[PDB]
Amino acid sequence: IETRHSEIIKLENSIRELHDMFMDMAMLVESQGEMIDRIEYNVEHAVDYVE
Amino acid sequence: ALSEIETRHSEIIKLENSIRELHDMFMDMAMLVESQGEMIDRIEYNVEHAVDYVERAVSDTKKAVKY
Amino acid sequence: LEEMQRRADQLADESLESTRRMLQLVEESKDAGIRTLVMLDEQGEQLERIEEGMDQINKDMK
Amino acid sequence: ELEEMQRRADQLADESLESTRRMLQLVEESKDAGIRTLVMLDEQGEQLERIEEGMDQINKDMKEAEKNL
Numbered sequence: 165i166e167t168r169h170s171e172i173i174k175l176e177n178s179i180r181e182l183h184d185m186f187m188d189m190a191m192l193v194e195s196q197g198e199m200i201d202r203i204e205y206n207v208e209h210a211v212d213y214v215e
Numbered sequence: 216a217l218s219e220i221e222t223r224h225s226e227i228i229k230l231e232n233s234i235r236e237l238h239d240m241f242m243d244m245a246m247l248v249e250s251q252g253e254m255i256d257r258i259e260y261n262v263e264h265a266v267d268y269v270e271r272a273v274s275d276t277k278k279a280v281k282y
Numbered sequence: 283l284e285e286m287q288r289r290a291d292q293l294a295d296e297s298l299e300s301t302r303r304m305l306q307l308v309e310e311s312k313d314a315g316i317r318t319l320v321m322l323d324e325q326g327e328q329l330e331r332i333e334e335g336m337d338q339i340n341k342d343m344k
Numbered sequence: 345e346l347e348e349m350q351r352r353a354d355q356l357a358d359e360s361l362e363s364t365r366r367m368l369q370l371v372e373e374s375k376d377a378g379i380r381t382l383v384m385l386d387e388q389g390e391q392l393e394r395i396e397e398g399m400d401q402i403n404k405d406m407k408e409a410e411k412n413l
Contacts, residue, residue, distance in 0.1 A: 168357070169293045171364045172227075172300045178371045179304045182237070185378045186311040189244070190318045192385050197321050199392045204328045206399035207335040210265075213406040214342040217349065223294065224356040226301045231363045231370075233308045238370045240315035241377040247322045248384050254329045259391050261336035262398040268343045273405040276412035339402070 165290050165293050165297075168361050168364065169297045169300075171361060171368070172297045175364055175367050175371065176300045176304055178368065178375070179234070179307050182371050182374055182378070183307040183311045185375065185382075186237070186241075186314045186318075189378065189381065189385075190314040190321075192382070192389070193318050193321050193325075196385065196389055196392060197325055199389075199396055200325050200328050200332070203392065203396050203399060204332050204335075206396070206403055207332050207339075210339050210399060210402050210406065211335050213403065213410070214339045217353070219294065220353055220356055223298050223301070224360050226298065226305065227360045227363050230301055230304055230308065231367050233305065233312065234367050234370050234374075237308060237311055237315060238374045238377075240312070240319060241374045241381070244315070244319060244322065245377045245381045245384075247319070247326065248381050248388070251322065251326055251329055252384050252388050254326075254333060255388050255391050255395070258329065258333050258336060259395055261333065261340060262395050262402075265336060265339050265343070266398045266401055268340065269402050269405040269409070272343065273409040273412070276409045280412050
């Protein structure tokens with residue numbers, strides 16, 4: 165019981181870290197999504213420019 | 216006694232299953248990101264190439280206008 | 283042996299609360315994971331269009 | 345029976361510890377993967393900035409060229 169609890173408390177520490185990492189990851193990907201959105205647009209207006 | 220031991224066991228197993236799905240999500244994430252990174256490398260390359268083309272194209276027209 | 287059963291029960295309760303907190307964290311992490319993967323898939327398609335587009339610009343310019 | 349129930353208890357208790365020990369491993373693997381991913385995303389973000397910057401120039405020069413023509 166004392167060891168299981170000890171192993172569980174440690175796992176909680178790593179799961180907290182993993183969670184936080186998952187949340188920051190999602191935000192990064194979203195910000196980059198904004199750029200790509202703009203890139204895709206600027207590229208469409210470069211295609212109709214070359215035509 | 217038994218009911219509690221059963222619940223704690225059950226919760227831990229449910230967690231391990233959930234953590235296995237999360238592990239897979241990250242593995243799949245790294246795969247997708249590395250792949251898109253190669254496509255980004257190329258796009259970056261095509262963009263610099265176009266920049267030089269367009270830059271010369273405008274220079275040509277600017278010179279023409281000048282004379 | 284009463285205070286002992288008392289401790290064991292306390293630790294067991296802590297271990298359970300910890301496990302439930304971990305379940306909560308993992309749930310939100312999965313939701314973010316799902317949103318992220320969906321965004322990446324979308325982003326993958328946009329980058330493919332961006333690449334085809336740059337080919338056209340580069341080609342028609344020549 | 346009672347002896348068996350205790351067998352079950354020791355069974356579940358032991359399974360919980362091992363599940364916990366496996367989770368510690370899967371989580372560690374996930375984290376490393378997440379870090380590699382973060383590293384890649386960081387480099388890509390900068391690449392995307394130049395890409396965007398290049399496209400701005402492209403649409404700028406193209407408009408100028410078209411104007412000049």
